[model samples]
Target: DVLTKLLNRRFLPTIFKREIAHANRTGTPLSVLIIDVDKFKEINDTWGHNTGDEILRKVSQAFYDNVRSSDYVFRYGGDEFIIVLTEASENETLRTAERIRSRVEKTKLKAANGEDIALSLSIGAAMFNGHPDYERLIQIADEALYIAKRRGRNRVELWKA
Candidate 1:
């Protein structure tokens, strides 16, 4: 939260519990998107840590800006973020990820030398169909994220299952 001004992982469990209960009670679908910076270590090495922080701040802001105020966004640890879309369907979740990815790609951040640095995001998406276990959603999304990473970075992949 300090770095990106987004909620930290500590808040995930409690908040996710409420979201899960709400979704289950209403029989609504809840979607999760896990986003990771592509080649982040190289970026840090190339631009330095401050520039990397700036990129993360900008990327976090982009994610915050793209989603509805009602949706939840969190820093899921280094170079990664998680978004919870309540009452969202598969298409809506996918569209939201694409929108954020596109926005982040267009954003321009500068290194200390004042050169524009290229940034990209790889996102993994999963939908909760009344699954009581919130952790499973995250795991599934994480699995999908790995899929996106394997398929090549800067793209979105929804969990097939």
Candidate 2:
């Protein structure tokens, strides 16, 4: 039932709009964490989409369970999920990202063909820069995600620039 409950992608644009307004009205800072499943395509290629799906469901459940009721987790794309940390500082977001990464690092799966799979997460973090702009937040997080993936797959990187 949970996996069947993915939010409409259109809802995200609208939600981002309101969240920006809310952040601007209040003094609280917001943060974004772009979390990616490392080597997901490889998993699909080696195991098949069904097993890949099983892996996704397990990981998605972990993300959903780890956050407070106020936070949000979005299925941004295949192998990519976005977590918006409302009223959280950059350090808080980073801590959350690291926690997620560690959780995923310990997760293991078995393919139908009996191959062992160990999952990892590469996470990117970005805090609002007083602009209340969603696109820039996403961009910064994406850049940091690129860095995290390049530096090493199971790591978290915060946007500095």
Candidate 3:
């Protein structure tokens, strides 16, 4: 049931529109954070796909544990996940991201071969303002994710402007 908790891609656009309207009407900022598991394929190669899946499950739980109940977290296919925060300031989002990063770092996944594998994630966040298009906001967050991966793995980067 927990695995089924992910927000399906089919529903994302409508959900995003509702969130956007709420933010716009309330004059509050909404933010989207994209979190990517670093070197996930490499982990699968070194260990096995089953072990990789275990890591993903644990990481997903860690994210859910750190974020608020009102916030939304979804598996964005593959090794990527997304978090939606309503009425969140940049500083608050950054702090929330740090909590997720720290909690995930503390997690240790066991490979099928009995090896202990460490996991890390790269995160990017973009704040929405002035009723911008949802697609554009997602693109901005994705760009920030690119920069975070470029700088280094296991880090959080905020969208510039």
**Top candidate (lDDT):** 1
Q: What is the C-alpha lDDT of each candidate?
A: 0.87, 0.84, 0.85
Q: What is the TM-score of each predicted model, taking all chains together?
A: 0.93, 0.93, 0.93
Give the per-residue lDDT digits (tens) of candidate 2, residues 1-161. Answer: 56665555557777887888888888787888888999999998988899888888888887877778788888888889888889878777877887788888888788886767989999989987777568888999999999999998899999995
Clashes of each: 0, 0, 0
- Model 1 misplacement above 4 A: 1-4
Residues 30-107 of candidate 1 have per-residue lDDT tens digits of 899999998888999887898888788888888877788789888897789999998778888898899999998898
Sort the predicted structures by lDDT, highest score first.
Answer: 1, 3, 2
Model 3: lDDT of residue 159? 94
Error of 2 at 142 (Å): 0.3
CA lDDT of 59 in candidate 3?
84
Per-residue alpha-carbon lDDT of candidate 3 for residues 1-161, written as tens digits (9 for 90 to 100)? 45667776666688799999888888887899999999999998888777887787788788788778778887786889989998679899998898898888888777776767788889998998665588898899999999999998799999996
Q: In model 2, what are the clashing residue pairs, if there are any?
A: none
lDDT of 1: 0.87
At residue 98, what lDDT does model 3 achieve? 89
